[PDB]
Every structure is written in C-alpha cells, then in structure tokens.
From Swiss-Prot:
UniProt keyword annotations, A-Z: Glycogen biosynthesis, Glycosyltransferase, Transferase
Annotated HAMAP family: Glycogen_synth
Protein name: Glycogen synthase
Pathway: Glycan biosynthesis; glycogen biosynthesis
Family: Belongs to the glycosyltransferase 1 family. Bacterial/plant glycogen synthase subfamily.
Segments crossing the lipid bilayer: none
Known EC number: 2.4.1.21
Binding site for ADP-alpha-D-glucose: 15
Record's keyword annotation contains Nuclease: no
Record's catalysed reaction(s): [(1->4)-alpha-D-glucosyl](n) + ADP-alpha-D-glucose = [(1->4)-alpha-D-glucosyl](n+1) + ADP + H(+)
Role summary: Synthesizes alpha-1,4-glucan chains using ADP-glucose.
Amino acid sequence: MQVLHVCSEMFPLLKTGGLADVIGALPAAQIADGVDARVLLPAFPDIRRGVTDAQVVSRRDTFAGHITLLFGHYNGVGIYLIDAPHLYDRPGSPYHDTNLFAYTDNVLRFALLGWVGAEMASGLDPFWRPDVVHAHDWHAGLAPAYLAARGRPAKSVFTVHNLAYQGMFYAHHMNDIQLPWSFFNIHGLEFNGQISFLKAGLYYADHITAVSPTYAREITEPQFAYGMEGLLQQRHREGRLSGVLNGVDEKIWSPETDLLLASRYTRDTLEDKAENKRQLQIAMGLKVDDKVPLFAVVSRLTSQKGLDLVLEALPGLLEQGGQLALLGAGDPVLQEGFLAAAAEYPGQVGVQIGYHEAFSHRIMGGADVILVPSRFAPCGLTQLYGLKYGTLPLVRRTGGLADTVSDCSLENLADGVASGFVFEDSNAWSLLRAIRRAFVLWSRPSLWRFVQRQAMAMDFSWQVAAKSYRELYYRL
Ligand SMILES: OC[C@H]1O[C@H](O[C@H]2[C@H](O)[C@@H](O)[C@@H](O[C@H]3[C@H](O)[C@@H](O)[C@@H](O[C@H]4[C@H](O)[C@@H](O)[C@@H](O[C@H]5[C@H](O)[C@@H](O)[C@@H](O[C@H]6[C@H](O)[C@@H](O)[C@H](O)O[C@@H]6CO)O[C@@H]5CO)O[C@@H]4CO)O[C@@H]3CO)O[C@@H]2CO)[C@H](O)[C@@H](O)[C@@H]1O
Ligand SMILES: OC[C@H]1O[C@H](O[C@H]2[C@H](O)[C@@H](O)[C@@H](O[C@H]3[C@H](O)[C@@H](O)[C@@H](O[C@H]4[C@H](O)[C@@H](O)[C@@H](O[C@H]5[C@H](O)[C@@H](O)[C@@H](O)O[C@@H]5CO)O[C@@H]4CO)O[C@@H]3CO)O[C@@H]2CO)[C@H](O)[C@@H](O)[C@@H]1O
Ligand SMILES: OC[C@H]1O[C@H](O[C@H]2[C@H](O)[C@@H](O)[C@@H](O[C@H]3[C@H](O)[C@@H](O)[C@@H](O)O[C@@H]3CO)O[C@@H]2CO)[C@H](O)[C@@H](O)[C@@H]1O
Ligand SMILES: Nc1ncnc2c1ncn2[C@@H]1O[C@H](COP(=O)(O)OP(=O)(O)O)[C@@H](O)[C@H]1O
Ligand SMILES: OC[C@H]1O[C@H](O[C@H]2[C@H](O)[C@@H](O)[C@@H](O)O[C@@H]2CO)[C@H](O)[C@@H](O)[C@@H]1O
Ligand SMILES: O=S(=O)(O)C[C@H](O)CN1CCN(CCO)CC1
Ligand code: NA
Ligand code: NA
C-alpha cells in the first residue's frame, strides 16, 4: 500500500501551526505500521534547505509554468519537492506576505500542488506511484479534483484540519487551472459563486476524514460548517466521513527527553518540573513564586482561539492570585491587547509576541495550566502537549478538546479519569468558573498531583492513528 501525502508544511522544515506537526510525524508512523508513505511539498526555501539528498525526478510544463520534481529524504521519510522558484521561492509564510496579505497568485500556487499530487498517480515518478493520494486542507483540495478529471487512477482521501479556511478564488480562474468547466457546479467545486479548494477536496475525495471524532460530527452542523454542512451530511450518510484523532510526536514533545528544557522530568518525578517554572518566571519577568499557579498560552492569535475571552477574564485570574505567560502571533488587536496587559501588570503578566519554537517548550515545561478556550478546535495539539507535560489544560468542550480532556468533576476524580478543566460556553464568565475550579484544585496539592499523573498517563500515538488510516485505505 503506497500513500502520498499532499500538503504545504512539515515540521521541522516549515511550520505555521499544528498541520506541520502532523505531516512531520504521521508518515513515519505509517511506515512502522506497514504503509509505504511519502510526502509531497512545494519547494519553499526552508524545505528545500532541509532536504540535502534531493535528486531530480522530472521536469514538466504546467498551467502554472515549469516544475522540477525533486525527491529526497527527511528523517527517514521520502519527500517530493515541487521546485518552481517563480511560485515558491519566497521567504516567510507559504500563504501570505509580510504585510499579512494572501499572495495574489495563491490560486496557481496551490492548484499546482494539487495537480502534481494527482499527476503522481499517473507515473510522474517512473519508479513509484501511490495507490492512495492523501490530501490535507484546502491547499491540496484540488488533488482529488484532478484525480476525478482523469478517471481516478488512484483513490483519494481528503482530511480537514480546519473547515474555516476555504480556499476561495473568483470563478474566472477556472480559466487558469486546467479543470473541466463543468466542475464549476454545486455538484463540484463551486461554492456560493466562487471556486473553493476546500469544497473541491470535500466533494471529489473517495473519503473524507477530520482530525478528531467529534469534529467529524460537528462539521455536519451549520455552526461549524459555515455553509458546507449539506455536503458533509450527505457524505456522512454515504459512509464517506470519519474522524481519526491526531497523535503527538514523542521525539519532540516529551518532558522525559526534552533537550530544550532546563530540567527533564517524568510522571513519577514531577518535583523536577519546578526548576522549569522558576526559569520561566525569570524569563518572562514574573515574580519568582512557587505558591502561585502559572497559566499559559501558546497560540496563533486568530478568532478561532477564544483569546479575547482570556483578555476579559484576566483581571479575575490576577485577582485570585494567578500569573499569566503568553506566547503568540496573529491579530494586532489581540497582540496590542496582551502587550497592554503585560505593561499594566508587570510581574504578573508576561507576554512575548511572535513565533518561538524553542520558547513554547520552555513554557509547556514550566507552566501549571495551559489555556485553550477555543471557539472551535478540529483537534488541538497544544492541549495534548499540556497533558504530556503535566501542564493541566483548561479547555472549552468542543471538537478535539472534547475528545481528549476530562474535567475534574466528582465522577472523573472518583473514577481516576480527571485530567484537566473544562468549560462549556464561549464567554468570560464560563471561562472564569473553570479558572476558579483550577484555583480550588490548586489548594489541594495532592489532588492536583493526582490529576497531573493522570494527564501524563494519557496516550496519543501516531502508530495507533496510522492503524486507522490503514484500515481506511484498504477499504477503498
Ligand atoms: O455539493 C453537493 C451537495 O450540495 C449541497 O450542500 C452544500 C453545497 O455543496 C455547497 O456548495 C453550498 O451550496 C450553495 C451553492 O454553492 C450556491 O451556488 C447555491 O446553490 C444553488 C445552485 O448553484 C443552483 O444550481 C441550484 O441548485 C440546484 C442543483 O443544481 C440541482 O442539481 C438540484 O440539486 C439538489 C438535489 O436534487 C438534492 O438531491 C441535493 O441533495 O440537493 C440539491 C439542492 O441543493 O437542486 C438544486 C436546488 O435547486 O440552486 C441552488 C440553491 O440556490 O446555494 C447553495 C446553498 O447555500 O451549500 C450546500 C448546503 O450546505 C446539498 O445540500 C447536498 O445535499 C449535496 O450533497
Ligand atoms: O544516473 C544513473 C541513473 O539515472 C536515472 O535514475 C534517476 C531517475 O531517473 C530519477 O527518477 C531519480 O530516481 C529516484 C526515483 O524517482 C525515486 O522514486 C526514488 O527511487 C527509490 C524507489 O522508488 C524505491 O522503490 C527504491 O528502489 C529500490 C527498489 O525497490 C529495489 O527493487 C532495488 O532496485 O533497489 C532500489 C534502490 O534501493 O529506492 C529508490 C531510491 O531511493 O529515488 C530515486 C533516486 O533518487 O533519480 C535517479 C538517479 O539520479 C536513470 O533513470 C537510471 O536508470 C540510471 O541508473
Ligand atoms: O499549521 C497551522 C494551520 O495552518 C494552516 O492554516 C493556514 C491557512 O490555510 C491560510 O489561509 C492562512 O490563513 C491566514 C491568512 O493567510 C491571513 O491572510 C489571515 O487571513 O489569517 C489567516 C488565518 O491564520 O494561514 C494559516 C497558517 O496558520 C492550516 O490550513 C490549518 O489547518 C493549520 O491548523
Ligand atoms: N507563537 C508560537 N510560537 C511557537 N509555537 C507556536 C506558536 N503558536 C502556535 N505554536 C505551535 O503550533 C502548533 C499549534 O497546533 P494546534 O494546537 O493543533 O493549533 P493550530 O493547528 O490550529 O495552530 C503547536 O505545536 C504550538 O506549540
Ligand atoms: O482571501 C482573500 C480573498 O481571496 C480571493 O481573492 C483572490 C482572487 O480570487 C484572485 O483572483 C486575486 O485577486 O487574489 C485574491 C487573493 O488571493 C477570494 O476570491 C476573495 O473572496 C477573498 O476575500
Ligand atoms: O473563527 S470564528 O469561529 O470565531 C469565526 C468564523 O470561523 C468565521 N469563519 C467562518 C468561515 N469564513 C467565511 C465567512 O462565513 C471565514 C471564517
Ligand atoms: Na483525520
Ligand atoms: Na495555534
């Protein structure tokens, strides 16, 4: 069984969020579990730099101009690179410029990614053809469309990591992407008068998955589907929609072996976590104090994440005696909001605006609680990281957060299953109740420790996930 993942990022070469973590860890797991998995990526500069054994497979002309298909290895896994400097040789985000504007040629940049994915099924590499093309998010949404247009020389799976990003482009681009004009149709890739790459992925794939079981249910509802729910409801009925929960990469996210930490520690040596907390406090300029709970954020600042609620709840949290340590980049409204708060409450609020890979580890390793108040959550990895690190996640009960965290309710404590704090509604009052719950647990240190150990017993294995994907692949 040969599978090609078609996507636009991969840890550690290029990462803007959780997607890259998946692509960086799933293929290796699949290989261990008996699937021959390779990855197709655009040759963004950081990716091209990391693959040092890249060889030429092929040159082709294309609706988007010429490509050199390269192939090499990263961390044991076979990586194809689409080298097209005129599209991909630019620094920064794969999706937008410095000023945060989407590239105006995105339709071509990402249509090409989908086209090469499909072309791979027809022998673009003379030495290896995938049986299944596995496309990820809107970026790769056209891959199943190109496959359909060519009589499905391979089966296709489309997985949604996020339904809010739709890959909308004006209809006139049907002229630019070499698909049948008849594909522009509610029964096809049209979506409210435009082209949608997400719609294309959802419509044309043999099978759709979402990155958690409850998000797979949620996206059949108007609240989480943003107009797409009818397709998803229909695909559910056809048995063509399912959820497979993400794992965590243990090579990189384990306090037991984490080389980025001041101090490594284990589920049975949580005393060794304290030095991380002290150095985190020092690093952020917080009062060095171990009697006080340190709450943390490591998050893209976008609407999805509910961080406005954190801002509203901040006074309440501070009033109860908590500290906050925040790392994130996105909306300036949010950015300015938090910078202001750190100015207003020095020694209590530490903030760092920007993307810092190593610093997120030091936060995860030193904080007591990780705040994930998301409005929606296809899966969420940072809460999984909190669990592994004994950093209790405080989450909204939605999507993968609902699949993965157990509230410290009386039943859950009594059954030995409690692992964090859960609130229901997207408002600060709801958030604040969960925060109070945390303060109550914090005043019973042995109960806190009992919940940490249970959080750290939770297992999120990629090889276990690989097994589900494999069953899926064989049943197509
Ligand atoms: O894609 C298959 C899927 O479609 C619906 O689910 C969602 C859809 O995928 C999504 O794109 C969006 O649809 C909006 C669309 O983008 C807009 O263009 C507009 O749709 C209008 C159409 O453009 C227009 O052609 C016409 O549609 C008629 C169809 O052409 C016709 O074939 C017929 O199809 C119906 C089938 O008979 C029925 O079995 C099927 O389940 O539902 C179809 C009806 O939608 O009838 C159509 C209606 O006359 O008018 C359209 C309505 O103005 O607006 C669209 C809705 O906002 O959102 C969709 C819902 O989330 C279907 O719900 C889903 O069943 C199907 O699998
Ligand atoms: O210069 C001499 C050489 O030149 C040309 O080969 C080049 C190819 O034309 C070009 O495509 C590229 O080859 C890539 C290949 O496309 C890519 O798929 C990958 O090949 C993998 C196989 O996919 C994989 O199956 C495995 O092959 C095994 C094979 O299973 C086994 O039966 C036995 O043959 O051992 C093989 C090698 O272990 O591994 C290979 C290698 O990873 O990578 C290829 C190499 O980069 O680049 C080629 C060399 O530059 C000519 O076409 C060729 O005939 C000439 O001999
Ligand atoms: O790995 C994290 C995240 O990456 C992917 O999301 C990207 C979107 O697909 C992409 O459109 C882009 O969205 C941003 C716009 O470019 C920007 O103009 C502004 O609108 O903010 C948008 C939202 O952030 O950037 C993100 C990169 O994070 C992927 O699809 C997600 O599943 C994934 O979780
Ligand atoms: N500002 C940041 N600095 C460093 N890492 C970040 C930052 N923001 C997010 N991350 C990382 O990105 C990933 C986010 O994954 P996830 O929680 O699934 O959410 P999403 O995919 O929606 O971004 C995590 O590895 C997280 O640590
Ligand atoms: O996401 C912003 C914007 O994207 C699309 O507009 C494209 C357009 O399709 C291209 O032809 C060109 O003008 O560049 C734009 C950005 O990539 C959507 O069509 C539009 O609705 C959306 O707001
Ligand atoms: O992120 S939020 O949940 O707070 C807001 C919604 O996700 C806004 N969406 C839904 C789909 N979009 C198109 C507008 O319907 C843009 C992202
Ligand atoms: Na999935
Ligand atoms: Na994030």
